[PDB]
Design a protein around this ligand. Structure first.
Ligand SMILES: N[C@@H](CC(=O)O)C(=O)O
Ligand SMILES: N[C@@H](CC(=O)O)C(=O)O
Ligand SMILES: N[C@@H](CC(=O)O)C(=O)O
Ligand SMILES: N[C@@H](CC(=O)O)C(=O)O
Lengths: 355, 354, 354, 355
């Protein structure tokens, strides 16, 4: 038997209509108990099993999977989530870490990439699966993606030792700090543009063990709740004025992700470049990411943004760059130079270095 | 014979190494003249043809294609382009509109989507093709995507009556105000996420005539050079503070595209919503676009951004929303309400209504 | 309320292990009854509803959906199916046509394209949906594609007036005579290479009404059980000998689909071409389809197969060409010439003319 | 300097209109000479270089590339090619192996996959690139894919040590015995359904060295010209009759590829199974391949074709199965059982043994 904790934080998967719009919906365990694919009553009764704990039917091979449902209060639309909410989730996993073999987190899709990236950094030396999932349609609506998404998450966390924060949707498992939301309506809502999926589900389960990170049983779980809140993301657009960038980078901002064009380029008008220098001199750290979905920041043009306090983000997603920026800036007693060196290193599989 | 104007504005296609980096490179016509696929010397000599004008070899069917090369000065990395640069390009097309049957614009890829979207709006009632193109590798490097991209542009503009600003790359023709750059290295650099390509090239040329806009031969070309410069784009990120949004939306800003999550949602914390209202009261117009590559802004959540001065962008790209915002706000003597009505309408094929 | 007939013919969806391999599995209605997503016990009891008939829970909009399960005997692995089996299925639909508003046919995937194509031709002037479906993993196994495939079929047939034989798999609805099986393991097992899906299911249901065929309420259902059995498929391979083709095309064969290379080409060695002429003189009809997944048979080479009794299959799938050949040859009292004209015309949406 | 042999066998790339249809076209070297991208006159003259030999302009990095054009006679539409034509090509490569560092073979697309597969088997212990290429549109037509396809082949063979028979089309390099033609009109005409491309070309060249086979410098090139001619391919279709299968498998046929449904199934009607057994008793060897594009043949159904003289083709393409059948059957002095063991083994990277 393997025991999982299922953390319900909110999002479309549980949602209910109310006033003609979707809002977060309570009473998940009550529903799941009535669904044979989520709960084997026969096995639970013949094991006089705790009434708070559910049991999946047997799968083909492997151990049996049991799980407990922790429903947070209040439940949130993921659009309203912030760094504090993701810290609370990390703390729930810390508190219950020893009692369970894996974790599944039900989450809204709107900011799921940000949440997976954050938790990836907060949960240092993680040894157990933390699988995020969600749905474009609520589980109470008849025709939905939620049933198969939730079941798959539980089976993956239940049956495999993948020690990463991942995202499971639409029969695929992605590295959490590598995903981005690409479609607002289709069930194939997420994409891992610069890395293969960690796993694919069909008849067979195919896992890329060559990519999955190795369990460091030696080192204990450290949960970083000291994340810098004053970080931002700024998308460059053609002709963005120096005066607007000056205003955006004012104190108390400590770090910013600049989303630049193509292979990492921006306008070279000197007054704009001057505001970036000025901000560097005040101590701001800047990471350069590409607005493009696929590919890497690379020098090579007269317009490439490099220099004073500007670290290349290589092929990182913006969601990951931002979370990493928050992590590194929150570490205590480091120099500006040391902080940039950490930003330029692959800390959780979020970044591919060249040769 | 069909005569085309080839406008070389800059970008990687012509570029040259200098100080170990790529910068814009002059002398295009000189090079093209030496390439048989771009210039038929035999036909030019046997027609004693102007020395500034080149001639493509005969294609399978259709008329012969001639073209003149106008090389702008200075040449630009597209990362440095602004609304004024795109206006200059529209003006070149206006000045020479009667003399040519089509236009091809060589452009850097970094801001090509912004440029195609801008020209789409500036060139009202366009009757002739205006085809943008570029390359991830310069034409002077041996292994490149530039040869085939440029030739395809010239043949499309030269042989078909597609009255739109388009982008031709990697054997596909896209509606210009529908594209976005998705790959910084691969030759398949562009994508039209919410609309099919207008055309595909292989053995056959396949054109989606069901999508191509109709020539309005009744109405003359109007070229809008009064585009509002004070428009911006703002990407929401989780926990973005009200104080930072306040600072961003200060005067003199007149319009902004808010890039929101998923189907058009943002944080509902009241102090943030309050700063959007405040800015609406100052007369700011806001368009809501999705950060997602594919799909549409739709109401349906308690977190959906709608209301005071906020127009839904449906499935518009951000590049297109931003250009449309610039166009509509530049029109003289319209009420705020009329401006929002135009923003909610499909003006150049950039937007699908439900 | 809309009432559907669910015809269970066999295939993996229902299957059971036995002797270490998968074989067809009885007792479908018994299982479905126990699944809340397939049967609303509360509504059935509060309507004292027939015990043989199930009821789907309410969907968002639309009418309620009820359905009856007809489990054929014996059940078949689709690899064993033939024209007679598909005729039987058409006859079941004919016998019960008036009593139901739609049909769903559970079928093995191995020959599902052949079956959908056949039924498409057999069911002339169809007014109601006939949706085929199946699964790579049985519905009794916990992790499967069968639950969502079957439910989607029932909801599509139950809620929409799509008067075609279709295939529903993996959240997509395809025109049946346009599909082919491309993957032996993945859940995305099927592809419609030369036509868009008729519909896609996500948050919204998107239907291509521009493609869906029109209901001919005036004309009654005619069910062709006169399908020619003596038709075959022959795949050319490099250096295939004339003597082997002679043997293949001997009487009593009446029609053959030649699967040729690329854009419709074969070897031009004269003894091979001579055997095709000889067979034409005996009255054999030949349809030329491409071995390629995507694209169209087109003349243009010295190696193109055209002439005596050879009709181009354009962009038809082989499964569709073969079924159409069976249909046309089964029609009574037509001249060879008229038969070839029908083969060259789009009769059920299986073929795009240039 | 690296010197290549360019073997022009025929196909659409060189073709000419004549009587309103495309036929093979002579005079390739004459044309290429006039194209600056294929011939640097300045460098050739300043090196007083042989008049039969051309020279590519300099590429970014790497050595300079020179090449000689050998134009076969007669030139062929690939639809008319046979085993004897592919043997002649292997013999050309054998004769000239020591003089050149690589080979490019221009070939019609209609049977290119069969040709690449054949050469793969014929050229044992190959150490140098043999790159096949072709085009959907002739090089003399203005708007074509031929220029870039031919140039890329020459640059790949000229600049990298990939010791395989490959196919280069539309900016991708595929393992030759893994490809199949999937589109009769689009420039993306080929697909490698069960294996990644060996390489991709863009700004950067990306090579999957993890997949490319290793140079066996110890072992010399052996070229097999004893290939069995009496092999065939038979596609099963629903209700195919026993009497027709009997006629197809008559002597002198020695081997056949059965293209079956899905994961490797056919009809189980006993009279059909009886004809397969009869043919096995006459000494016929049978390989089972899937009609599916992205198929592996796997047992698991009552309809799976396995037994007397029937070898599973796993994920092999039919073109590869058919060539392999011709190779193995042509080897001298082997027992029927030994022949089947070779058919079941990955000999040139054409087959993945499963997980
Ligand atoms: N607005 C929802 C979107 C979803 O879950 O699909 C959320 O993020 O909570
Ligand atoms: N940096 C270049 C990119 C390109 O041309 O591909 C530009 O936009 O001008
Ligand atoms: N062998 C099965 C395949 C399936 O159902 O998926 C059949 O064709 O009956
Ligand atoms: N029929 C031609 C097709 C091509 O080359 O594209 C050949 O195979 O020679």
């Amino acid at each position: 038997e393997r025991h999982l904790l299922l953390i319900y934080t909110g999002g479309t998967l549980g949602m209910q209509s109310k006033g003609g719009v979707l809002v977060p919906g309570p009473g998940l365990v009550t529903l799941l108990r009535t669904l044979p694919m989520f709960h084997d009553k026969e096995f639970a009764q013949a094991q006089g099993l705790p009434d708070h704990a559910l049991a999946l039917p047997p799968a083909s091979h492997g151990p049996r999977v049991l799980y407990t449902v922790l429903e947070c209060q209040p439940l949130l639309d993921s659009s309203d989530m912030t760094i504090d909410d993701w810290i609370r989730i990390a703390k729930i996993i810390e508190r219950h870490y020893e009692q369970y073999q894996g974790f599944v987190v039900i989450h809204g899709t709107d900011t799921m990439a940000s949440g997976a990236s954050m938790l990836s950094f907060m949960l240092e030396n993680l040894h157990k699966p933390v699988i995020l999932t969600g749905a474009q349609v609520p589980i109470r609506v008849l025709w939905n993606d939620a049933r198969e998404n939730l079941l798959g998450a539980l089976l993956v966390a239940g049956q495999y030792i993948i020690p990463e924060v991942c995202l499971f949707m639409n029969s695929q498992l992605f590295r959490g700090n590598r995903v981005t939301k690409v479609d607002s309506q289709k069930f194939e809502a997420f994409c891992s543009p610069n890395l293969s999926p960690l796993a694919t589900v069909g008849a067979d389960v195919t896992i890329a063990w060559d990519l999955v990170r190795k369990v460091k049983w030696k080192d204990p779980l450290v949960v970083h709740s000291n994340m810098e809140h004053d970080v931002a993301l700024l998308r460059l657009y053609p002709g963005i004025p120096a005066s607007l960038v000056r205003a955006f980078l004012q104190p108390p901002l400590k770090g910013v992700v600049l989303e630049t064009f193509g292979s990492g380029n921006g306008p070279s008008k000197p007054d704009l470049l001057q505001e970036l220098r000025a901000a560097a001199q005040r101590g701001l750290i800047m990471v350069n990411c590409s607005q493009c979905l696929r590919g890497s920041v690379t020098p090579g043009y007269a317009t490439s943004l490099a220099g004073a306090n500007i670290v290349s983000g290589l092929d990182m997603t913006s969601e990951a760059a931002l979370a990493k920026l928050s992590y590194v800036l929150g570490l205590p007693e480091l120099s500006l130079e040391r902080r940039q060196e950490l930003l330029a290193k692959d800390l959780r599989g979020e970044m591919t270095l060249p040769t």
